[PDB]
């Protein structure tokens, strides 16, 4: 009876792989970016990357190649998952609908095989006869390619060499020839086979097995007009082909390992080279000719180019541009130039994509102490290292604050025909109208001629021809800049009130009910045009001359009343085109027409809070897309604001919301405000690029943040953050940190770049003497970060060869001080395991870092929580509970020993604890008995844990070695001396992500209980909530209904995907639900949606509600 729910909050951002080619069209250049279970598809351009398709998959993309057999119009995509789902995809655009189609698929795992060294490798013969694979030691799977083989049937051949490093097919080979580097006793060797598939074996490969260097690791296979193989070790790079052996040893590279490569020149004279360091190389192959004879190779060399992010994936594109995929930090777009700028760096960054990197640790914090949490993460490694701040929604900064319990509208207003700036704000009111002249930034209310005060203004827009307009209930008035009086005034021939207004900076359309007039602001007067009545009452109107319309406006749209409807109409004629008969007994409060970059838009709000938006045509004018929205529970009002280059639409509800732009779509993100009624852009000298926004009472003004449902702030560390605390009483973060350094000629240790810990404002170093008795080492610091400025206030450097591994911020014993405690360890490569380390207590004073108390320990402190005023701390294998003396020292109370190695610990407030390295997780009470530890229970499987958490008194979350999540509770069972000493795995789930951290927290607010967030090696931030058996079931069922309906990309089984899984167990998922999947429900067409129901009760669109009332859980 465990029931939980998991959702992605941030898709993974690390880039595990990426390929280039023509997959969209035979002419079109594509960049395929592989994340984990997300496939990004862009078209490269002059500018950069036209994003085009974003599919997710039910698998961890392990292999990714493009390729094209004969009689093929464009490239096809081969994809191999980490659970051995092969498949072959194709790009399919049915005019406007885009689709990725599965041309073939099948699962290629084998019952045998222990997975090899260097993990999976997929390769493809250039002639496209087949696909070669290495998944296991000793075997080599081959998937022969034919028009069919639509189930990718493959056979293994046997492989003498039990330990292969890398492998490619060679070029210019008659028979499909592989080439590989492998290690046996002695050293490493380079071997070749042919591959005949007829008889399925190998045969002999073109040339003798040669030797290669101890650390040869990459194999490049040079295209046709050269052929042969490039081999890359440390300090050294070599070429082989038949008798030909060319080699170089450029000290330049010795400094680091090559790690990724990429052909630039189809012919293959040039290649990029990636480095553990971030360095980028050009590898040059010097050709050479003779007449009626092809082309040898005379030499090859390396030329440093500069510095990218640390590259996994690396891909030349258009002229001198290079996509650089990074998992350790930010992926980026990069220009190589022929000349080197300042410092000799032929490399220039063009763009830069935010990668939450490895999230090594993280935590929550209400910075501006509000009610939402921000999130703060340690990220990257080495130079990419850094901190990232993450905040839900779009926020705004408030300047003035005039509380006006009424404001029923507002429009801009300049009082000078010159300046782009305005100085008045006229505002519809509680059956009145006030005005607001400004000394610029200062508030003042007066009067303007021909603008009623006791009559309630319905509009105020900026009409050209040097005049000011006020539509009131009664008249649509007119005023001037020149005359500035009763310049004109239109009164309804009958003494009947205006209902709906609509002034354009040139045109005017009012409505009297079903009555529709039309007037014009021609030089200093209001001339009239058409009259037309409608079926029912005019609900709402909008007119704005769209794209190819100077002032004068093309067609239009209008919400009506009793029939509840919206409809397409032209101008002085008033001719009905198309219309939608929406449901309900509540009318459209708001209808809007717009543009962005490449489209014209129609949107329509209802009184309930829900919207419908559809796509218009300034030419044809027909339907678009029907997909009601949620939004407020209150009538939404739509207005447009001034922003960047693609100005947007703000939605006023109780839940205020922006409508930005996606790929060519429209973002639908929260705005961080309590309630907004009406809103408009602004510019005054005193309040520029501002927006105005009123509520129940208060006018506010200010600018607007990024876009995305998430805004992300970052603090480059230049090194590798490890842990992170928040001492709030000190208004700062504490952060464990680490930089590398090298031996000197003096012996000691230099460094390799300025770091967060060397550029520190102040600084310390451990004095402590508790111990006695080229080359790389780590240097570790506690760091103190201003929570407001994100500066390295102070730095404490730790001992020579100490790792600080844990960090807490707490009060202790009776002592009223809030400390920063730090578990450490003396690490050495000759020791398989550390047996020395220390806990240290620290304080941050004025700007001071007091070393309050140390405490040597006989092991590595792996973690430590504040307990109940005491200090709990895992030491290497022991789990210990320290006390604070009034004499201000850490002294023992008790310890547990029954651990293979305690890595993680958490606390159920009371006296309950938990965790272990290669077992699964135990449960421990502390006892106000004799103050002892009692081991309540454990779980006997064997999960190399990575992360642990406690949801409640019974519920224990676990993440581990193999990207699985799992839950434990303890048995409700008679015979409580075994059935109690054991706790059962009541939830299992494959996340497909490696989790470093859990924590209670949430990103939202000011159905489901609890909320734990998690952070992954890959950039993914997910969330785990608890559920009610019923809700579980409503959703379990709905998972199954839903799977049948959705066509999964590589035709992969969702449930195969989510199946708990190790190298010795595969159970299906119990007691977990991905909203990820549930959320899919919303992307589905009503047809495919009705289906999901044939059946307390059962509806049809009832659930569409439930599913929104879920997304909003993060």
């Amino acid at each position: 009876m465990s029931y939980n729910y998991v959702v992605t909050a941030q898709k993974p951002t690390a880039v595990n792989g990426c390929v280039t080619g023509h997959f969209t069209s035979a002419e079109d250049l594509n960049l395929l970016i592989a994340k984990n279970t997300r496939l990004e598809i862009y078209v490269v351009t002059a500018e950069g990357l036209r994003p085009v398709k974003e599919v997710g998959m039910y698998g961890k993309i392990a292999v990714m190649e493009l390729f094209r057999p004969k009689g093929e119009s464009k490239d096809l995509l081969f994809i191999l998952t980490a659970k051995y789902n092969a498949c072959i995809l194709e790009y399919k655009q049915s005019g406007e609908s885009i689709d990725i189609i599965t041309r073939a698929h099948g699962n290629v795992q084998d019952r045998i095989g222990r997975p090899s060294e260097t993990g999976i490798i997929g390769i493809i013969d250039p002639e496209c006869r087949m696909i070669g694979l290495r998944l296991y030691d000793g075997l080599f799977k081959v998937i022969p390619l034919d028009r069919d083989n639509k189930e990718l049937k493959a056979f293994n051949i046997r492989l003498e060499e039990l330990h292969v490093i890398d492998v490619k097919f060679l070029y210019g080979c008659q028979a499909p020839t592989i080439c590989f580097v492998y290690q046996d006793p002695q050293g490493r060797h380079v071997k070749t086979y042919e591959v005949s598939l007829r008889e399925k074996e190998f045969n002999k490969g073109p040339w003798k097995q040669e030797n290669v260097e101890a650390e040869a690791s990459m194999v490049i296979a040079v295209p046709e007009p050269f052929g042969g193989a490039i081999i890359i070790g440390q300090e050294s790079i070599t070429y082989h082909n038949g008798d030909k052996y060319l080699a170089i040893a450029p000290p330049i590279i010795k400094q680091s390992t090559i790690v990724c490569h990429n052909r630039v020149d189809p012919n293959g004279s040039r290649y990029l080279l990636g480095d553990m360091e971030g360095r980028l190389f050009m590898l040059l192959l010097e050709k050479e000719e003779q007449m009626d004879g092809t082309v040898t190779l005379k030499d090859l060399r390396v030329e440093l180019l500069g510095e990218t992010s640390i590259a996994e994936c690396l891909t030349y594109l258009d002229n001198g541009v290079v996509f650089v995929g990074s998992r350790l930090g930010d992926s980026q777009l990069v220009k190589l130039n022929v000349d080197s700028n300042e410092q000799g760096s032929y490399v220039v960054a063009m763009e830069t994509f935010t990668n939450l990197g490895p999230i090594v640790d993280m935590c929550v914090v209400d910075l501006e102490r509000q009610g939402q949490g921000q999130l703060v993460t340690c990220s990257g490694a080495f130079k990419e290292g850094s901190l990232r701040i993450i905040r839900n929604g779009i926020g705004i900064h408030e300047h003035a604050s005039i509380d006006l319990p009424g404001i029923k509208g507002l429009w801009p207003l300049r009082s000078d025909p010159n300046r782009e700036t305005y100085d008045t704000l006229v505002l519809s009111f509680v059956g009145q109208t006030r005005v607001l002249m400004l000394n610029g930034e200062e508030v003042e209310e007066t009067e303007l001629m021909g603008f009623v005060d006791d009559q309630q203004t319905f509009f105020c827009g900026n009409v050209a021809h040097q005049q000011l307009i006020q539509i009131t209930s009664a008249s649509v008035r007119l005023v001037s800049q020149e005359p500035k009086a009763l310049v004109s005034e239109w009164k309804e021939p009958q003494a009947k009130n205006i209902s709906v207004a609509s002034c354009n900076s040139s045109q005017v359309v009012v409505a009297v009910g079903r009555a529709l007039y039309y007037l014009q602001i021609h030089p200093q007067e209001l001339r009239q045009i058409s009259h037309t009545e409608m079926e029912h009452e005019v609900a709402c109107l909008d007119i704005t001359p769209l794209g190819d319309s100077n002032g004068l406006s093309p067609l239009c749209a209008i919400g009506l009343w009793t029939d509840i409807s919206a409809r397409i109409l032209k101008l002085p004629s008033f001719e009905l085109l198309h219309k939608e008969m929406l449901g309900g007994e509540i009318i459209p409060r708001s209808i809007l027409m717009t543009t962005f970059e490449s489209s014209h838009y129609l949107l329509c709000a209802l009184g309930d809070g829900a919207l419908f938006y559809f796509g218009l045509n300034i030419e044809t004018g027909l339907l678009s897309d029907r997909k009601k929205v949620t939004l407020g529970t209150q009538p939404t009002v739509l207005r447009t604001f001034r922003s960047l280059s693609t100005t947007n639409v703000f939605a006023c509800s109780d839940r205020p919301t922006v409508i930005y732009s996606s790929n060519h779509k429209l973002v639908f993100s929260n705005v961080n405000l309590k309630e907004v009624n009406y809103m408009c852009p602004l510019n005054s000298d005193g309040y520029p690029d501002s927006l105005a926004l009123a509520n129940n009472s208060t006018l506010t003004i200010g600018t607007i943040d990024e876009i995305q449902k998430l805004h992300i702030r970052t603090v480059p560390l230049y090194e590798s953050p490890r842990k992170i605390c928040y001492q709030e009483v000190s208004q700062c973060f504490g952060v464990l940190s680490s930089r590398i350094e090298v031996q000197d000629t003096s012996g000691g240790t230099t460094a390799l770049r300025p770091s967060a810990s060397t550029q520190a404002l102040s600084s310390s170093v451990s004095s402590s003497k508790l111990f006695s008795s080229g080359e790389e080492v780590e240097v570790h610091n506690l760091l103190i970060i201003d929570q407001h400025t994100f500066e390295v206030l102070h730095a404490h450097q730790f001992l020579q060869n100490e790792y600080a591994l844990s960090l807490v911020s707490c009060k202790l014993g009776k002592d009223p001080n809030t400390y920063f405690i730090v578990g450490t360890a003396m690490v050495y490569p000759e020791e398989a395991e550390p047996k020395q380390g220390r806990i240290v207590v620290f304080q941050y004073s004025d700007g001071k870092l007091q070393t309050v108390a140390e405490k040597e320990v006989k092991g590595a402190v792996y973690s430590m929580v504040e307990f109940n005023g005491k200090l709990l701390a895992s030491i290497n294998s022991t789990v210990r509970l320290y006390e604070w003396t009034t004499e201000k020292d850490v002294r023992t109370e008790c310890n547990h020993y029954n651990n293979i190695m305690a890595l993680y610990l958490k606390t159920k407030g009371d006296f309950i604890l938990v965790g272990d390295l290669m077992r699964s997780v135990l449960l421990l009470a502390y006892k106000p008995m004799e103050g002892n530890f009692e081991e309540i229970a454990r779980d006997f499987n064997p999960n190399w844990m990575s992360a642990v958490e406690i949801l409640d008194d019974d519920n224990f979350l676990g993440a581990e070695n193999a990207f699985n999540l799992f839950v434990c509770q303890k048995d409700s069972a008679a015979t409580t001396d075994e059935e109690r000493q054991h706790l059962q795995e009541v939830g299992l789930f494959h996340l497909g992500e490696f989790v470093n951290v859990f924590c209670h927290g949430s990103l939202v607010m000011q159905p489901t209980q609890g909320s734990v967030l998690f952070g992954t090696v890959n950039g993914m931030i997910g969330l785990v909530t608890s559920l009610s058996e019923s809700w579980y079931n409503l959703l379990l069922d709905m998972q199954n209904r839903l799977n049948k309906v959705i066509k999964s990309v590589g035709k992969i089984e969702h449930s195969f995907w989510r199946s708990f899984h190790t190298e010795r167990k595969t159970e299906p998922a119990t007691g977990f639900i991905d909203g990820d999947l549930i959320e899919s429900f919303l992307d589905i067409s009503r047809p495919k949606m009705q289906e999901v129901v044939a059946n307390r009760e059962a509806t049809a669109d009832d659930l569409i509600k439930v599913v929104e009332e879920l997304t909003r859980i993060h």
Binding site: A381, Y803, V827, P829, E831, A860, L903, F994
Partner: peptide, 13 residues
Amino acid sequence: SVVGFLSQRGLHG
């Protein structure tokens, strides 16, 4: 050393 592995089994490479 449990370290060399264990502080790297974060990075993930």
